């Protein structure tokens, strides 16, 4: 069985790429499989600001370090990329600029600067947050499309629309679905359909005493109740305690590897992997925004498909 484990254990790659000259970090990854290749969009930070970028499509993770890094002329910070089958169109969702969250569309998601003009996807605000809504994800079932987000404030938020309405502005409304301390429900929410397991998986980034880490929750439906799965820093979904990463304490904002680029955000638990951001634990960053984040890949320990998966 590929059922998600009670106790997670991973092995990690080394840093998978360095930012090209003029950039300090690569962050906040979103990945889709595309024509047999890895297609990764990301935030980046330079000396003074954030932007967004993509890597040239690459077959193997070893390839990521030399893939070409192309900046987007219109920033799409903390992006989400997927294919929306009921419109036969690719979507890139992001924060800031013309609306709290925006969407843009394309027939070919590898045209880094070929996306449509952004339109509003969400125009709400939330209470008790110094950032406002950040770090969206989007995911659908057969009935509805859902937007989940966080706010640096201990809360996870949700809104939805009918499947047949998408895309449109979700609007101004949102609901708190999880609440805890600021540290416990902080950033980088992601939600997935777990293939073959008849369930949904949520991960949320938390600030731990040893580093950033992910906490997991599961639900029976996207409009259902989320209950904690692996929520402690000592036994997290993914963190210093169980990553196998020697180079980074942080296990931070990224994307599980999706089996299917579509709007269901499906993952194959038999092939469970996390594309994350980490940073050198042996240097103290100048500032958070100058932190030297880099991509890394976790692969779950003990998979039946381990060898086939690791060797690609
Ligand atoms: Ca994200």
Length of the chain: 312
Residues 223, 228: Cα–Cα separation, whole Å: 16
Residues 153, 14: Cα–Cα separation, whole Å: 31
What is the SS3 assignment for 110? coil
- CB atoms under 10 Å from CB of 116, counted, come to 13
Count of H helices and E strands in the chain? 1, 21
Pure H helices in the chain? 306-310
Residues 138, 299: Cα–Cα separation, whole Å: 24
Determine the CATH number of domain 1-312.
2.115.10.20
Distance 40 CA to ligand 1 centre (A): 12
Q: Can you say whether residue 60 is alpha, beta or left, with left for phi > 0 and alpha for psi between -120 and 50 degrees?
A: beta
Residue 191 and residue 202 in contact, taking contact as beta carbons nearer than 8 Å = yes
Residue 84 and residue 65 in contact, taking contact as beta carbons nearer than 8 Å = no
Question: Considering just the CA atoms, what is the radius of gyration of the chain in Å?
Answer: 18
Q: Which residue has the tokens 């009670």?
A: 6
Residues 77, 136: Cα–Cα separation, whole Å: 10
Strand partners, 238: 214
DSSP-assigned letter for residue 65: G
Residue 277 and residue 243 in contact, taking contact as beta carbons nearer than 8 Å = no
Distances (CA, A) of 253 to 28, 30, 207, 215, 244: 5, 9, 12, 12, 17
Residue 289 and residue 23 in contact, taking contact as beta carbons nearer than 8 Å = no
SS3 content of the chain, % helix, strand, coil (to 5): 5, 45, 50
Q: How was this structure determined?
A: X-ray
Residue 79 and residue 29 in contact, taking contact as beta carbons nearer than 8 Å = no
Distance 214 CA to ligand 1 centre (A): 13
**Measured CA angle at 187 (ends 171, 249), to 5 deg:** 165
Distance 212 CA to ligand 1 centre (A): 15
Residues 212, 225: Cα–Cα separation, whole Å: 25
Distance 183 CA to ligand 1 centre (A): 18
Residues 63, 39: Cα–Cα separation, whole Å: 12
Q: CA neighbours within 13 Å on the CB side: how many for 306?
A: 9
Residues 94, 119: Cα–Cα separation, whole Å: 11
Task: Tell which residue, 55, 133, 136, has the closest CA to residue 94.
Answer: 136
Distance 253 CA to ligand 1 centre (A): 6
**Measured CA angle at 42 (ends 37, 44), to 5 deg:** 140
Distance 273 CA to ligand 1 centre (A): 15
- CB atoms under 10 Å from CB of 19, counted, come to 19
Residues 54, 221: Cα–Cα separation, whole Å: 32
């Amino acid at each position: 069985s590929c059922a998600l484990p009670t106790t997670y254990r991973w092995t990690s790659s080394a840093p998978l790429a360095q930012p090209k000259d003029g950039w300090v970090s690569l962050k906040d990854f979103t990945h889709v499989p595309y024509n047999g290749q890895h297609l990764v969009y990301a935030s980046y930070h330079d000396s003074t600001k954030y932007g967004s970028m993509a890597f040239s499509p690459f077959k193997h993770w070893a390839d990521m370090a030399t893939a070409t890094q192309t900046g987007m002329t219109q920033a799409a910070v903390a992006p989400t990329v997927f294919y929306f089958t009921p419109k036969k169109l690719w979507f890139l969702v992001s924060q800031w600029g013309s609306a709290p969250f925006t969407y843009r569309t394309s027939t070919d998601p590898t045209k880094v600067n070929g996306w449509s003009a952004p339109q509003p996807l969400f125009t709400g605000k939330v209470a008790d947050s110094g950032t406002g809504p950040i770090d969206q994800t989007v995911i659908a079932d057969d009935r509805k499309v859902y937007l989940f987000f966080v706010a640096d404030n201990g809360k996870v938020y949700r809104t939805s629309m009918a499947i047949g309405d998408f895309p449109a502005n979700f609007g101004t409304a949102s609901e708190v679905i999880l609440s805890d301390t600021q540290a416990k429900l902080f950033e980088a929410v992601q939600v997935y359909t777990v293939a073959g397991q008849n369930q949904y998986l949520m991960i949320v980034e938390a600030q731990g005493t040893n580093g950033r880490y992910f906490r997991s929750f599961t639900a029976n439906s996207l409009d259902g109740e989320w209950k904690v799965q692996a929520g402690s820093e000592s036994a997290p979904f993914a963190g210093k305690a169980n990553s196998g990463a020697s180079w980074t304490n942080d296990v931070s904002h990224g994307d599980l590897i999706r089996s299917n680029p579509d709007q269901t955000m499906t993952i194959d638990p038999c092939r469970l992997q996390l594309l994350y951001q980490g940073r050198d634990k042996n240097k103290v960053p100048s500032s958070y925004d100058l932190a030297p984040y880099r991509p890394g890949l976790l692969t779950l320990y003990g998979l039946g498909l381990e060898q086939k998966l690791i060797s690609e």
